[PDB]
Amino acid sequence: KVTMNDFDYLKLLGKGTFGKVILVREKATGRYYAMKILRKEVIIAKDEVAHTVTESRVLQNTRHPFLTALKYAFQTHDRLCFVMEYANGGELFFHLSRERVFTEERARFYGAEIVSALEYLHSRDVVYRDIKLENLMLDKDGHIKITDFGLCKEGISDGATMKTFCGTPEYLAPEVLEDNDYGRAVDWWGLGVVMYEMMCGRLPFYNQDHERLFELILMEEIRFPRTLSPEAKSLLAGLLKKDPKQRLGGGPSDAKEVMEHRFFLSINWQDVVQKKLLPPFKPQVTSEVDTRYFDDEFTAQSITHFPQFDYSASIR
Amino acid sequence: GRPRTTSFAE
Ligand SMILES: CCn1c(C2=C(N)NON2)nc2c(C#CC(C)(C)O)nc(O[C@@H](CCN)c3ccccc3)cc21
Numbered sequence A: 001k002v003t004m005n006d007f008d009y010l011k012l013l014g015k016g017t018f019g020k021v022i023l024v025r026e027k028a029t030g031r032y033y034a035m036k037i038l039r040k041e042v043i044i045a046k047d048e049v050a051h052t053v054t055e056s057r058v059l060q061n062t063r064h065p066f067l068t069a070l071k072y073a074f075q076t077h078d079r080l081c082f083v084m085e086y087a088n089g090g091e092l093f094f095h096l097s098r099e100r101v102f103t104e105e106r107a108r109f110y111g112a113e114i115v116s117a118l119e120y121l122h123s124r125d126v127v128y129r130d131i132k133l134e135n136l137m138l139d140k141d142g143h144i145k146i147t148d149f150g151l152c153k154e155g156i157s158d159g160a161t162m163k164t165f166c167g168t169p170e171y172l173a174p175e176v177l178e179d180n181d182y183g184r185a186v187d188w189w190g191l192g193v194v195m196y197e198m199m200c201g202r203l204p205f206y207n208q209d210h211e212r213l214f215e216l217i218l219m220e221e222i223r224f225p226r227t228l229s230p231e232a233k234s235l236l237a238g239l240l241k242k243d244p245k246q247r248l249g250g251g252p253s254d255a256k257e258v259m260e261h262r263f264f265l266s267i268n269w270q271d272v273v274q275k276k277l278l279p280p281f282k283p284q285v286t287s288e289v290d291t292r293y294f295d296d297e298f299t300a301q302s303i304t305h306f307p308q309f310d311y312s313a314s315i316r
Numbered sequence B: 001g002r003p004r005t006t007s008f009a010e
Helices: A040-045 A049-061 A092-099 A104-123 A186-200 A210-219 A230-239 A255-259 A269-273
Strands: A007-015 A019-026 A032-039 A070-075 A079-085 A136-138 A144-146
Touching: A007 A032, A019 A079, A032 A040, A040 A049, A040 A079, A049 A070, A049 A079, A092 A136, A092 A186, A104 A144, A104 A186, A104 A255, A104 A269, A186 A230
Parallel strands: none
Antiparallel strands: A007 A019, A019 A032, A032 A079, A070 A079, A136 A144
């Protein structure tokens, strides 16, 4: 069985209300990983057990170049621990914040890898439900790595629906802001918001008052910079179609609609998944313990059983 | 640069 003191704990990469993420070295191999350490007390308090177990279980079987690979899942009497590959490039949120805006070309590159990942998940009857800049990270080479699978629902195929009011406020699709249920198209809306952010340098809707924000999502029309290309405008218009039945990727073909959109005219989708496309930005990390693409806010800081957890990549 | 968003459920 795997335990806490099998690792050296080097730097805090992130901290939130659910828990914290830490750069760790595996003592037994000397290799570096990221560890997410959630407290059971908080999870049981917020009644997020199913979601937290879902996160492990989905990672235990998924394999894809642009999804974060889970090395270990294990636990203590009071903590839940995920050990995954350290994304040296950090979050897209970090980069977009620093650079303000990406070129349509650079956006097209990240978008294509996210579409690849979403096609994979949706083919596996899994809706991710939380596409955002915080959950899109970059590996040392500069490729997309989707992270945090704690709001995934399983058994959702074309037509199937979901009932949990969940996601991130600024990224919630308008149908999620209605009664009853919604479908897997919510993911394509999510892509739409991040694509809009990457090319327009802001969310399509924003207000710190959720009541005001949720009204904007349902009612307000999206605007575009004049300079934005017609195809770029068309993609965002399609991805951010308020009606999910007429949203790009919301039909039965799922990702094939998005893939066949003219914004990705230059993209070969088999080159995408085979990693044959060259990243426009390569993380300038000098060592393995380098945390330059993470915030000083975190890196400056010092440092009853859940079933269906306790997984290992060497064993399964 | 918008502020850090926080995911949620129910
Ligand atoms: C610190 C950034 N980070 C990383 C990093 C890696 N794997 N290498 O570097 N950073 N992995 C994260 C994963 C993951 C994962 C798996 C694959 C195990 O599902 N979930 C994160 O969630 C956020 C919450 C967002 N709703 C969080 C932030 C702080 C504290 C607790 C949660 C953040 C993550």
